[PDB]
């Protein structure tokens, strides 16, 4: 149930993230190349530490087991928008967590960071991750055509958004 | 027209860019804040020197007028895409230059850089710029709702794109 | 009047800045020690170019005479507040310039930086700075008791503020 | 009671500071984003190591349990003024400890740092903390309108202060 | 069989890479001096950590025995071309493993890196490796005369290649 | 003719180099993007001075007009091979210069650097580069299928070579 | 006199200071060895740039004569004290300048810097300088026995001071 | 008895010094602020290592127990004077050591370092530490008025001196 | 017998080399001063790592015991010559290894590195190390007169050479 | 007897060197302040690591007890001259060891460093050390008046020397 | 002749050296590749600044002609030996300068540097240079077989030397 | 005479220094190799500014002609000794200058730096340097046998000295 908590990504967490980062089947849905030496990782972690344009979160339960990773990135502070990215680890999918976690990100985006808009990309051939975002109040503002090469072909993604005045009320 | 040339942006060009970069009715169109020390610009230009992820171009004519600037930014070499942007210096607009300028950018994109997709963002409330793009072959693929805060209001823009296939088989 | 504009602070402006920063009866109303090497200015200018939390502006008349300094400082992007501070050069005071430049500060804050609150500090013994701010919409939120030592004694300053919504719809 | 020591924050207090710097409830009262990786904290500590403009104090009891933090920040040596802030650890709340930590930081400010004015900022929605300050001699000098965005709303804050002659006479 | 994983080379694979980089017999087939102190390898690894122009893969089996190395080097993102090379460990030779490592690196090149052409260089004196490549779809495009000095004599090499449409159609 | 000489590439030659490196219909036959800041040239020149694996040469006529560029690159000292690449400035082509400068490349490679093999890459759609190399002794060792994207398409290049012994005793 | 001004020491002033710094009958009075490379002075000046613990001031008159130098050094912000020192260039002494100069230093000390105690060291054998100080309100608080080796002899000096209270209520 | 020895301050000694440095009741008599992170300490130790203008000594007995700290600072080599500072740790006061230690400092100053004058400051409200220095041949050359803010008020210190020609003979 | 192998000098090997480097009786025959701190060594090892003009080898047997050190230095790549240096450790002399090892160096020089000439220096009062080199196909091209001060006097060395075309065939 | 080895000073001899560098009695004979933190010694060692103008030797016996230090400093390679100094450890004094350490450093200077003159400086108040030097062949060439301040008085020193031809003939 | 002087090579001399360093029939004689950026030369000169193991000298006459260059390199201070090399600029040869120049080098070597043995390498096929050396007192000590690849052939050289004893007792 | 003064060594003095430092028959009596780049001078000057253990002085006549160099080196602040070394420019020797400048060395050492002993080294084959030192109070404390190689041989030098007390009361 609602035992799930969001926390700041830490150095101790990089092995878990290193694993997700090299998983082809997971990183495809973030349109990120599945190749990352732990060293390269450690370093880009060191980079993200002094960077106000991102916030990375590790998602845990009460055993303190790593359940997943929410990211808010490209925070832009004139326009007050950021890009949202979510992964739940293989052994923690299916359990109905995504709503909770996706909503905590929004709570974060809108009640703390005081952003106007969250947006995201997802593959049009993820027709059910799409149902999800829509259930959480996201809607499609874009159908981006052949945006990303994923698994041997150019694919379509939807861009989806939610604003602060919607989520608040 | 057939006399406009695109060349890599140089250090001797940074006063031209500074001015553009600090002008309110020009930066609005790129969604970029109109404020930049010549000292910030120069340093950014030196880190730009190092970036394979961008090509910033300056636009000249016959007798050396700097007419404008074209960029291909966020060039991604797996997905083979880049964002395109353009400026015609205030004193050079409304001469039918843009058309030729957008079309030099695509030919660069697609005949040298060998990209697959150029995309651009343009204000819904910039309907002249929208109609240019459409007449060069850009089609809308998204209606970004209230994406930018510009001149005191959150504003919608169109995402548009064109593919390498369509340009070469134009 | 309609002539007047703010632009980014440049390196060739530092002589004019330095002049003002060693002026006692000027520096006194910014609560600032009137002591600064041209060299400490240059380093501190190099420091604060990159500093996203600040914007410094020189004002120019139609003939590009340096008229004053407008600054928006401590800009926080979560709370969307920043502190405003201005100086008009001694030889340009008493012209009716003040409201125009305050208005430009607020324009930039609210239509470009998309801020929610702008605040300032003004000495309780500088009435007619206090009174110009009033006529631009600033209201007192606090009386800071004995806040700064200036000219041999601890003096009281007003904290005053204006919101985005009020500015943009009055 | 007199069983509370204040002392300089050391590297070994950082796990403790970190945990507090990621508690949203605690950090709310400080007008403060509840996100801080350990590495970022240790870089900030390494920095203020050399800021004569700031002092950070851990509170300890007799047995030397870590009760809290007290800070004097923005110390100004022309104007002789600094901002005071205090956290007590959730676990050590409500034992009538805070008045002692306050008179402690005041005594440091006035009897050692030879300061002239201490101010603080406290939520208008926290009339119990305001009460607290009033008992230790703090005088409201401002009511800042919508100064901070906290928890989805812009809120008001009391700025308050105390002077050296008042605390020492 | 499908029991072979490819993954990014990590710091803990370096003793293994080192041992291979000092085997003259193995390194002969790579046109390559068989001398490399560990420190020099770790400096080279530290370097390519940040070369988007190269990818290095260790091969693992189910039990996660280190079978070999596969590399895509000189990746060019205008021309969309890279050089392929493969080592299998002496101890894991001759178990019909190489065809799988090859189709593996091809699939990475073509399905993830979205490359256009892969080439390799193979000894004209190694008609068994050439055979190997031919079965996985590689076409001889050059016969380089006396290209490399190996073992006291200047020898010829086949340059061969495969294209994306061919591997994916 | 007998006038022509190669010498080390110098800093005061970079204007002439830069010119050539932003030339499209020149850069196309070196398989190289025609985009390069004067500043990226200068850094890359600073890079490659020390680089023992390369030698870059400017050619001069009897009057010290910059005639072209000769380069020997990837020089490996175990295998004793290097890649050769040349450019004659547009305003000096069609003079009969080509063989003299190829001959100088080979002279340097074989009598100074003591190389065993020199190879080049030439476009299969640049016949008369292919044919000049033949007359200097270069023979085809390979046909690289669809090797480079140039001018909107993947093109085939010839790999060609000449050995030390053949050069020095024919 | 009423025309002498104190300003922060600048880089353009370091030849004036160099000369003073190398003059035997001027440095004796500060107990400082008369030997300094312009190169040492400049570097010290750059580290001085960074020091909140000091204010070095230059003394001008109406028509830009550099008359001297005033320092407040070892400024301590808990104990709120600083050492004061002064020089009048040889050619400007005996004009009754010192008096005004010592009194600009104290007013700076006590009206801006908000210090509590200025102190100074002066040679027992400099009884003119002693009498100046006493007439500005400095009183002796110590007789330092043989503190400095100056001109071949260990020598006594007077420590003198004045407090903020006494200056403001002068 | 005269088992007490003076030695060079070392890195291993910094915990003992760290303790003395944060003791309000001890550092008041050196007019030094009682606040010092171990890190700041470590660093200023690293600084004092390449500094010919100071010598710091740890004072030990035969158990090798840390008994105290003598310092000679601002050694000035034209004028041949330095400032002397002494602390004996809390558990080692009362035992009559100060004379010994103060005299070893002088032996150091005058028989080794070849200084002409040692001077010191002490609070006029330390009327007995004053008797001490006087017993060791120090005399007052100054009564410095309101020099230091200590424990909530400006206080007077005496300056006291001894010369080489006196101590020798 | 021919169990002896040549390998790249490594960091783990520096204690063994440190020993040989400080041995007066060994280093005399290399005309190198017998004085070298392990630190200086470590550093000049770090130097030789990014240096294409040398190759240093540790010579081992099958116990993996360190038997000796072959060096090829001043590799010059226009002229295709290098200087050869050999030491067998004290407890491994007399066993008849030198021929093997000297020949592996040549194999290295001529079959791998593709050099035209190997040369060496040896003291004329080493009349038997000279017989050796001559047995391995080296001949004297020089008798260098009073070249080196060794053990209290200027001494003569022979320079000796072998070329690639000789050794090959 | 012949049971004394000289060798280069290593990092592990530093505790030993340090202890000697803080003995006032020992350091007196070297004209030398007896104060040196360990960190300062290790920085000085790290420095001279690269000074071809100096050589430092620990003395060891058979069992490898650390007997002392010997140094050749200020080696000048135009003039071929260096200064010699020797310490024996208090614990190893008076066993007729010093003559052997002296002829040892002379032999290094003359038979290895090919130097021309060695000099030393020895207290005029130490006629037993002077005796020592005279027996090993050192000739007084100066009587330096009040050259050093040691122990509260300015004292005289003998500068002495020996030449290469004299030591080797 | 008695008017030739040797002085340390300076930064103002590096164009003279550059030219020499890039000339084929001059570098052959030193066995050194004829190719060097002025930028490489300058940097080498700055690391040369630091080297006790070398002395590079420039050769002037009466009226400031730069006639040449002399080096003593690989100076070894235990073995007390150095390699000597020499160049006379093309336009200054065949004037009987060399003799005096070789003999200034030895006197430096042996009267100041206090070396024991100077040695040199010279091409067997440079028999004029061989005869110079022999007439100054150099005698052969080795016949280095095919040591250098020069002008397309591996070539033999003579190692020659002279000792301090023989020069001073000349 | 009374004209002559010593002042700190400055950067604009280095041409004059360099001149002297490459002079053989000058450098010989400082036991110093006459070889030094202007660039090694500049670095070594940058080195030794900060070096508290040395003071270098140029002497000037009444018209600011560089007359010579006076140095006090190895200044140790425990033992309070330093080594003295002087040069008068060749074109200013034989004027009777020597004692004045030695006297200035001692004045500075004893009345400013508060030294106890000043020593020098002088060649036993430079009598009249030996004799001028005598007349300034220097007495021999040692005869250094074969101390330096100079001009083809090992030569003997005198070590000579003068104490503070003797200088200051004779």
Swiss-Prot record, chains B, C, F, G, K, L:
<feature type="binding site">
    <location>
        <begin position="126"/>
        <end position="135"/>
    </location>
    <ligand>
        <name>acetyl-CoA</name>
    </ligand>
</feature>
<dbReference type="GO" id="GO:0046203">
    <property type="term" value="P:spermidine catabolic process"/>
</dbReference>
<feature type="binding site">
    <location>
        <begin position="83"/>
        <end position="85"/>
    </location>
    <ligand>
        <name>spermine</name>
    </ligand>
</feature>
<keyword id="KW-0460">Magnesium</keyword>
<feature type="binding site">
    <location>
        <begin position="86"/>
        <end position="88"/>
    </location>
    <ligand>
        <name>acetyl-CoA</name>
    </ligand>
</feature>
<dbReference type="GO" id="GO:0004145">
    <property type="term" value="F:diamine N-acetyltransferase activity"/>
</dbReference>
<comment type="pathway">
    <text>Amine and polyamine degradation; spermine degradation.</text>
</comment>
<feature type="active site" description="Proton donor">
    <location>
        <position position="133"/>
    </location>
</feature>
<keyword id="KW-0012">Acyltransferase</keyword>
<keyword id="KW-0963">Cytoplasm</keyword>
<feature type="binding site">
    <location>
        <begin position="93"/>
        <end position="99"/>
    </location>
    <ligand>
        <name>acetyl-CoA</name>
    </ligand>
</feature>
<feature type="binding site">
    <location>
        <position position="40"/>
    </location>
    <ligand>
        <name>spermine</name>
    </ligand>
</feature>
<dbReference type="Pfam" id="PF00583">
    <property type="entry name" value="Acetyltransf_1"/>
</dbReference>
<protein>
    <recommendedName>
        <fullName>Spermidine N(1)-acetyltransferase</fullName>
        <ecNumber>2.3.1.57</ecNumber>
    </recommendedName>
</protein>
<comment type="subunit">
    <text>Homododecamer; dimer of hexamers. Exists in solution in a variety of protein homooligomeric states including dodecamers in an open state. The presence of the polyamines spermidine or spermine shifts the equilibrium to dodecamers and induces the formation of the closed, symmetric dodecamers.</text>
</comment>
<keyword id="KW-0808">Transferase</keyword>
<dbReference type="GO" id="GO:0046208">
    <property type="term" value="P:spermine catabolic process"/>
</dbReference>
<dbReference type="InterPro" id="IPR016181">
    <property type="entry name" value="Acyl_CoA_acyltransferase"/>
</dbReference>
<feature type="site" description="Could be important for selectivity toward long polyamines">
    <location>
        <position position="83"/>
    </location>
</feature>
<feature type="binding site">
    <location>
        <position position="32"/>
    </location>
    <ligand>
        <name>spermidine</name>
    </ligand>
</feature>
<comment type="similarity">
    <text>Belongs to the acetyltransferase family.</text>
</comment>
<dbReference type="GO" id="GO:0006598">
    <property type="term" value="P:polyamine catabolic process"/>
</dbReference>
<dbReference type="GO" id="GO:0005737">
    <property type="term" value="C:cytoplasm"/>
</dbReference>
<feature type="binding site">
    <location>
        <position position="74"/>
    </location>
    <ligand>
        <name>Mg(2+)</name>
    </ligand>
</feature>
<comment type="pathway">
    <text>Amine and polyamine degradation; spermidine degradation.</text>
</comment>
<dbReference type="GO" id="GO:0000287">
    <property type="term" value="F:magnesium ion binding"/>
</dbReference>
<dbReference type="InterPro" id="IPR000182">
    <property type="entry name" value="GNAT_dom"/>
</dbReference>
<feature type="binding site">
    <location>
        <begin position="48"/>
        <end position="51"/>
    </location>
    <ligand>
        <name>spermine</name>
    </ligand>
</feature>
<feature type="binding site">
    <location>
        <position position="32"/>
    </location>
    <ligand>
        <name>Mg(2+)</name>
    </ligand>
</feature>
<keyword id="KW-0479">Metal-binding</keyword>
<feature type="binding site">
    <location>
        <position position="40"/>
    </location>
    <ligand>
        <name>spermidine</name>
    </ligand>
</feature>
<comment type="function">
    <text>Involved in the protection against polyamine toxicity by regulating their concentration. Catalyzes the transfer of an acetyl group from acetyl coenzyme A (AcCoA) to the primary amino groups of spermidine to yield N(1)- and N(8)-acetylspermidine. It can use polyamines such as spermine and N(1)-acetylspermine, but not putrescine or cadaverine.</text>
</comment>
<feature type="binding site">
    <location>
        <position position="27"/>
    </location>
    <ligand>
        <name>spermine</name>
    </ligand>
</feature>
<feature type="domain" description="N-acetyltransferase">
    <location>
        <begin position="4"/>
        <end position="161"/>
    </location>
</feature>
<feature type="binding site">
    <location>
        <position position="32"/>
    </location>
    <ligand>
        <name>spermine</name>
    </ligand>
</feature>
């Amino acid at each position: 149930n609602s035992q799930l908590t969001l926390r700041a990504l830490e150095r101790g967490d990089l092995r878990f993230i290193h694993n997700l980062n090299n998983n082809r089947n997971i990183m495809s849905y973030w349109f990120e190349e599945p190749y990352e030496s732990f060293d390269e990782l450690e370093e880009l972690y060191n980079k993200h530490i002094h960077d106000n344009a991102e916030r990375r979160f590790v998602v845990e339960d009460a055993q303190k087991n790593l359940i997943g990773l929410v990211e808010l990135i490209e925070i832009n502070y004139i326009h007050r928008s950021a890009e949202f990215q979510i992964i739940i680890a293989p052994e923690h999918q299916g359990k109905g967590f995504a709503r909770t976690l996706i909503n905590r990100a929004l709570d974060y985006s809108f009640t703390i960071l005081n952003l106007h808009k969250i947006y995201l990309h997802v593959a049009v051939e993820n027709p059910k991750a799409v149902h999800l975002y829509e259930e959480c109040g996201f809607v499609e503002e874009g159908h981006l055509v052949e945006e990303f090469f994923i698994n041997g072909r150019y694919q379509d993604v939807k861009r989806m958004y939610i604003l602060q005045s919607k989520y608040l009320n």
